[model samples]
Target: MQILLANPRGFCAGVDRAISIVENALAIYGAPIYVRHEVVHNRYVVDSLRERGAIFIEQISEVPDGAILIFSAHGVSQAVRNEAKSRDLTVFDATCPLVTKVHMEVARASRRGEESILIGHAGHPQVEGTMGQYSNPEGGMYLVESPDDVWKLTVKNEEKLSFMTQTTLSVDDTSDVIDALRKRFPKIVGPRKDDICYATTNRQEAVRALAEQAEVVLVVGSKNSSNSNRLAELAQRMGKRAFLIDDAKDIQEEWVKEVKCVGVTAGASAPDILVQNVVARLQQLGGGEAIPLEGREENIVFEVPKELR
Candidate 1:
């Protein structure tokens, strides 16, 4: 069996910055540094940080007053910031700059009395955070996962509508949703630049390229991860058998039966070491001759927040 590895698959710039912030915070501030959520979606990454003295909490109330608190890369609502401020927490925002850009757009729109139509899965932390950025009596923000959802939206005024999207989305699927939005609301405006992060787009494109010659594909990511799930789903959508796994242990021999070529890629939050382990396991399971598929080179880097620096 031939194995095709995707380029630009793991550890995008934002993920790198988020993890580094945790590490740097731990180094400078000592143990028990508080984090509001998983710094990134990957359990392995979170576990490693925990072992290194990072404390993950679900609520800001759990953090001790005046202690350092780091926001996850998913970003947070204005309410969370207010909570942190009220608690006098030493806040370090590790929110991916790209996600921050979306937040800024929503804030800008809200000031103009423009309600936003957010394109993202309901209940996702990032979606919730972005939606919380602005609120009005008319329920200023709306969440829609598909074209059908877009059609069902009840807006106070279509003329004063704009749209934003989650950073990690399936590009092809989002495009379909966007097209639907345009058809349904011709006057709807979106961000001047696409909200889907460069990392998400690159990884999906790399997977699509790998899927062309691969009989089966494996996406290395945690189950709850939006971008990670999208990678696996995208592969299956392209007619390839795909599996989304946290690591090598999730691989099932039955899925690999009679498959000649397997493609491997990872989510933005996933570490490359997990990908290496998966490849090694594949070789142990009778895969041979791993080849790196030619794909886009990602050089984008997000700066660490000033508090950490």
Candidate 2:
């Protein structure tokens, strides 16, 4: 059976920069470097860093006064920043540039006392971070997951509204929400550019092409990875039998027994090593060498923070 691998899958520029920040801090500050949340959402990547002595925590209070702390790629709210500053811990921000842009945009709107509506999955750290940027106690910020959410949304003033998206969302899925927002609030402003990052758009496009050629799609990503989950769902939407797995061990024999071909891809935060292992497992299970599909998009590298350099 053919095992097809999709190009432009796994580890985007922002993920690369964030991981580098942690590794650089570890190399410079020695072991026990504290990181806020999973540096990126991949289990294997987080586990590897943990073995290297990186400590993951949900709160700044867990970190001691002198520890070196780093923010995850998901970014943090200004309140978290204020909290981090209150401590004596040395901190490095590993927030993706794209996510930072949204934070900045919302902060500006908040300063003007204008309301902002975030187009993102509720409770996601990125969404929370972006939402938290709306610091105007007098203003408001809303989270709407879909057009339906927009249909039910009630805001303070339509003219004082603006919309922004989570960087990891699918472009196709977000269009309807944007349209919904526009239809309801014609005066609502948007970001300077699309909030969905290049990695998400490219990976989703590649997966769509991959989904077209295979009967079953194997997405190597953690369940918590938003972009990875979207990749699998996108394939399923394309009418392919799709499964989002953490690694090859999650693959069941029955998934490929009668299939002519299986397509494989990974989420932006996932490591390529995991994808390689997935390919090796597929070959060992009965498939031949995986064929990499042609992809036209090449990812641009993001620079690490100045301190790391």
> Judged by TM-score, which candidate is best?
2
Model 1 bad stretches (over 4 Å): none
lDDT of candidate 2 at residue 169, scale 0 to 100: 93
Report lDDT (CA) for all predictions. 0.90, 0.91
Q: Give the TM-score of candidate 1.
A: 0.97
Q: Please give each candidate's TM-score.
A: 0.97, 0.98
Per candidate, the number of residue pairs that clash is 0, 0
Shift in Å, residue 2, candidate 2: 1.0
Worst 10 residues of 2 by lDDT: 296-305
Top lDDT: which candidate number? 2
- Per-residue lDDT of model 1, residues 1-309, tens digit only: 898999879998999999999999998899989998999999999999999999999899889877999999999999998989988888899999989899998888887877888899888889978988985555388888999998887888888789999999998889989998889888999966459999999998898899888999999999899999999998899899999999999999998888889999999999999999999999998999778988887778887867677
User: lDDT, candidate 1, residue 133?
Assistant: 90
